[PDB]
Write a protein that binds this ligand. Sequence first.
Ligand code: HEM
Ligand SMILES: N[C@@H](Cc1c[nH]c2ccccc12)C(=O)O
Ligand SMILES: [C-]#N
Length: 350
Amino acid sequence: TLDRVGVFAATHAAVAASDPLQARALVLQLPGLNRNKDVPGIVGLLREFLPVRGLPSGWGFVEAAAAMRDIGFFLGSLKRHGHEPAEVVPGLEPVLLDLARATNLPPRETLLHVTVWNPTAADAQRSYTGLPDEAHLLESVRISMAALEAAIALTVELFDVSLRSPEFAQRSDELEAYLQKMVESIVYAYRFISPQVFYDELRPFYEPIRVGGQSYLGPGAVEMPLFVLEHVLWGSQSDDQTYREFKETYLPYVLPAYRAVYARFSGEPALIDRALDEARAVGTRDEHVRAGLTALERVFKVLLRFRAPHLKLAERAYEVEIGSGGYAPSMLGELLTLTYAARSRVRAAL
Ligand code: HEM
Ligand SMILES: N[C@@H](Cc1c[nH]c2ccccc12)C(=O)O
Ligand SMILES: [C-]#N
């Protein structure tokens, strides 16, 4: 059914299969050291594979991304024990900045590095803690990432489709089907991840670190480019400053291509503004307009089926303080309000 996922999953698998620093067996030793809070041992382990002579000249994006992944788990870990990794590992910060340059991404690990770029096998998967709850957490993101990327592409495609065309209803139906994966992610997370273990044992690994005279956020599903999708779909012309700050916050953490998608659509009418202006000019007596708007309403419905239970998941965890993305769960309530208002505009048009 979801025939567009494959190419995205294949691009991730290429980084997941890469071990350019031959660090697999070394990184597996990291959970035990974290459990023991052995900060010197964590540093010594990292130094067994950290490049000291600069990056190998034949590396491409894949090798540099994979190297950032493997060094990256040591970054969150060190900070978890109360230490800036750059301050306790000499020669580390230049390597992190060279990897940022090679990948056009920040100089630490992101969500991409620790989930879809991270091999899945028990004898290869990297992890801060080695806990089952961390494994399910990574899996919850693997469920929807590739499908979300397909959904961004469909949203961009749909933006150039006329509401008068039968293609509009068909593309929106397809979009809705990919976005359903976000719902499946939250259902999985609610079923398999203990909020207690998350807050007490996992959350401490996602604090910010200082590199290059600024602060970089730790990994979190908040870095998934859903905000880019919705910037295009409904939020590009929003005048809510809190919302605009939220989106701009995560922009550095998404793939370069999605920063460029975001830039392309900023300060211009969102898909739904255009769709709704078209509906107003042409009338809902046009059968394709009616079907298009109905299909579009189902897209917002699925966004809400993600967002509302995600808010409960988040509050239940903070029922045991802000996320790794730097927000309290109250900002989640604000984004939900905006999403309901966007859906309401669509349903009022019908
Ligand atoms: C126990 C698991 C989770 C907790 C406690 C949690 C909590 C949070 C928090 C506190 C935020 C605000 C940003 C921050 O400060 O980090 C956030 C944002 C966000 N999270 Fe989660 N989250 C969890 C799992 C997930 C999962 C599994 C997904 C999807 C695969 C997800 C997707 C998002 C998205 C897309 C945002 C941006 C806000 C939005 O789109 O509504 N989260 N989450
Ligand atoms: N950002 C949320 C949840 C989170 C942290 N790290 C993650 C990694 C993957 C998925 C979700 C998360 C928090 O800090 O509470
Ligand atoms: C959700 N981070």
